[PDB]
A and B are shown apart, each in its own frame.
Chain A
Amino acid sequence: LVSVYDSYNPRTILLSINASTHPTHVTKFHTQDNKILATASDDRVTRLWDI
């Protein structure tokens, strides 16, 4: 599960996505584009998600 939190606001989950059943080791926001988020998993597929 990949979770997005508003910085300095731990209480509230802004967005939760289950990328894969396998562990998700890398989760990086795209530097150019805000909307899209990239995730890598032990599933070996690096899905590109969006908010």
Chain B
Amino acid sequence: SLVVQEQGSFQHILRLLNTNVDGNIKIVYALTTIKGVGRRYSNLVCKKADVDLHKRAGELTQEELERIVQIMQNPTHYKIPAWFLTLANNVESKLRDDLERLKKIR
């Protein structure tokens, strides 16, 4: 009668990086919602964390969450490439002068 799964139950919501992330959304695109994280950045962070890209955010385990955290805050120690991370008024006045003196000619 007593069955407990060691992985833990699916999590509808999670709190990552002071941000609420829906478990339903895919891990890569569920991670994009955090500010400063785009699709490519989330993809690379997932690859570094060794988290399968067929997983939902709710199914992630605690150690995977901690690993992706550590990847985000401390990018360089994991060797992420660095690349991956009045005049107009004067011209207007000149044009206006030109127009007024154009009227003068005409």
Indicate if A touches B (C-beta under 8 A).
Answer: no
List residues of chain A with CB under 8 Å of any chain B CB.
none
